[PDB]
Design a protein around this ligand. Structure first.
Ligand code: ZY4
Length: 372
């Protein structure tokens, strides 16, 4: 009953239906493994179709404390409180959780996105104002019998969030696990990067400067500058049969082809090798251009198919965003401090190539790839 409980629009996040308050007020909430605050629109905004009305909830409790949360894109401020929360197409339970009632925001809500709030699924360590503000998933686990794990199958878009377990109908092949290095963001270690099978040949610490994370709330694969530049050079070289404006590689301009003629085969596969559970072992996840060239729907341009380059630069380390998670079944196994990856039932592939999760791989180099 939890399958296909996620919806969204390409590039604008995936959301799950939730209710807050008594009587229940239904809101669509973006699923975000890259933050740890549960927050909902709580005042009128041009891009909000609806919002949380605290005055109408008898179970609402004001904590008399403001909070401000900045993201890479957007920011908001609001009032902290607690109230009853349920998930209609998730586990049938009711929990009392912290909620930030957003009363002011800047470049956060997105014109026509269909969500009104955000569910930060990361750990308390990064919650605002501080780690004493217990995150929603922690409250869910403490107050119910739900196992300490969830999984995300991100595929107008759709997908599934399976709370408390693993749904085997959602993936094929093996689940490979990489350790969660530190419990704040979902931090992992990348040990190797290849572009069409060619190693970027970089000290692996560069891939994890200064942390690498799995972040469903960020669209792009975001890379440290040194890695971004090397990857772009390699993708340019592989695709050199066609030349694109510099602005494209900067995500500042679309590339378009006549409908149905997108030359997928001139763009390389990208393989990210993640640290395994055993010393000097790794596995790789392989990303097709259908993932990192993100479709931009626009009827005005619809004689063509157009795309944005969904790999970009970061000054805070690697962010494996939605375009990386798409077509993989990703298990956030908090109980065992590990992240699992498998090919999902909605995997990306054409008749020549396919997204993959494969291992084991071994390196003789004993260096630890963690930056700190
Ligand atoms: C979904 C809307 N959206 C589109 C883009 C893009 C983007 C970044 C973000 C972004 O900051 N995501 C927020 C959640 C959020 C979701 C919807 C609207 C606003 C915010 C987060 O919590 O997940 C960040 N997590 C941290 C990131 C840094 O490392 C620590 C964790 C969102 C983006 N980029 C900067 S991008 O992907 O490069 C360009 C496009």
């Amino acid at each position: 009953e939890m399958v296909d409980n996620l919806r969204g629009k390409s590039g604008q996040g995936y959301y799950v239906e939730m209710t807050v308050g008594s009587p229940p007020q239904t809101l669509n909430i973006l699923v975000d493994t890259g933050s740890s605050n549960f927050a909902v629109g709580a005042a009128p905004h041009p891009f909000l179709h609806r919002y949380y009305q605290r005055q109408l909830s008898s179970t609402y409790r004001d904590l008399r404390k403001g909070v401000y949360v900045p993201y890479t894109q957007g920011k908001w401020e609001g009032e902290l409180g607690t109230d009853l929360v349920s998930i209609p197409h998730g586990p049938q339970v009711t929990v009392r959780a912290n909620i930030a009632a957003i009363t002011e925001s800047d470049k956060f809500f997105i014109q026509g996105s269909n969500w009104e709030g955000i569910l930060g699924l990361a750990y308390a360590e990064i919650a605002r104002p501080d780690d004493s503000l217990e995150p929603f998933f922690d409250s869910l686990v403490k107050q119910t019998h739900v196992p300490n794990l969830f999984s995300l199958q991100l595929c107008s878009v759709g997908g599934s969030m399976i709370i408390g377990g693993i749904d085997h109908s959602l993936y094929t092949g093996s689940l490979w696990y990489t350790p969660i290095r530190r419990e704040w963001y979902y931090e992992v270690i990348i040990v190797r990067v290849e572009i069409n099978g060619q190693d970027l040949k970089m000290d692996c610490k560069e891939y994890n400067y200064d942390k690498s994370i799995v972040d469903s709330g960020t669209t792009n694969l975001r890379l440290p500058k040194k890695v971004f530049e090397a990857a772009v050079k390699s993708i340019k070289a592989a695709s050199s049969t066609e030349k694109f404006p510099d602005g494209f590689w900067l995500g500042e301009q679309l590339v378009c082809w006549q409908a149905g003629t997108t030359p997928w085969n001139i763009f390389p596969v990208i393989s990210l090798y993640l640290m395994g559970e055993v010393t000097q072992q790794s596995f790789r996840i392989t990303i097709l251009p259908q993932q990192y060239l993100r479709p931009v729907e626009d009827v005005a341009t619809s004689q063509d198919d157009c795309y944005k380059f969904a790999i970009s630069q970061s000054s805070t380390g690697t962010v494996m965003g939605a375009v990386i998670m798409e077509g993989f079944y990703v298990v956030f196994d908090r109980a065992r401090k590990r992240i699992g990856f498998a090919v999902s039932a909605c995997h990306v592939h054409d008749e020549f190539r396919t997204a993959a999760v494969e291992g084991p791989f071994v390196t003789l180099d004993m260096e630890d790839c963690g930056y700190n």
